[PDB]
Amino acid sequence: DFEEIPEEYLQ
């Protein structure tokens, strides 16, 4: 149910 966060923060 979480909104996707900006791709820049992901790894």
Place this chain on the structure above:
Amino acid sequence: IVEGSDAEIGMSPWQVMLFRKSPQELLCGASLISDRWVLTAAHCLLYPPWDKNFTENDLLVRIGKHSRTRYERNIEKISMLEKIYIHPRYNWRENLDRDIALMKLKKPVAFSDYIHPVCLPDRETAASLLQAGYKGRVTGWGNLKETGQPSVLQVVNLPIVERPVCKDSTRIRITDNMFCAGYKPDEGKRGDACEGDSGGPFVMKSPFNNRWYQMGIVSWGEGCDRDGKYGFYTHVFRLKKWIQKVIDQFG
């Protein structure tokens, strides 16, 4: 948080969400103690009985949040972890004694109306305020009931409980590095932390200097908001020498 209420905007600007990268989900609460350091419960990161052992690259820290699930554009800030430090004498085998961990951020977070650190107590503030009957405040995005989930950050005020009552409420061996809080059955009012609130702060507002101090970390409890049970919190002051040692050596 069970039987709490919606937080006000900016009410707990030190509240941190520990967020799992994949799958994306809430892992725990935590608190901001400086521009580069975040405090949480060790069991949020390491708990072998449940096959839990997170490393730095598994997680993100989300600071300035109010909504549990939304990406709060222009308000929240998301930070990567440089390194995790778990108390070397964290007792996950027995009773969660010394349930504390620090996380150093890769980059300093900018403070704002929604992002601001909490104070850690000195001996005197701890002595003055950690007394049975004195109330603190717990916040988090954890479960609303033992067995759903909140739209926004929840808050509840709870009284510290006398140590013999804490001890008599459980078969677990309680230590000086824990305290408990919550209402007694006879007192009527209720409320408690729950699953997902782990790692979040138990804070008290000093009447001497009007500053908020983090006295506890949400650690453990037998169910949530059960009559005759109490929430247990890591005693932050008792472990402050370790906190300072880590920050001094690695900060």
Place this chain on the structure above:
Amino acid sequence: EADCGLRPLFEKKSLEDKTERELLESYI
């Protein structure tokens, strides 16, 4: 920090939140 524990939207502007008085009242 020198400014730790003072919230921008509360203490810094001398506004109280809706339940902090409950805490103060318990500090007897």
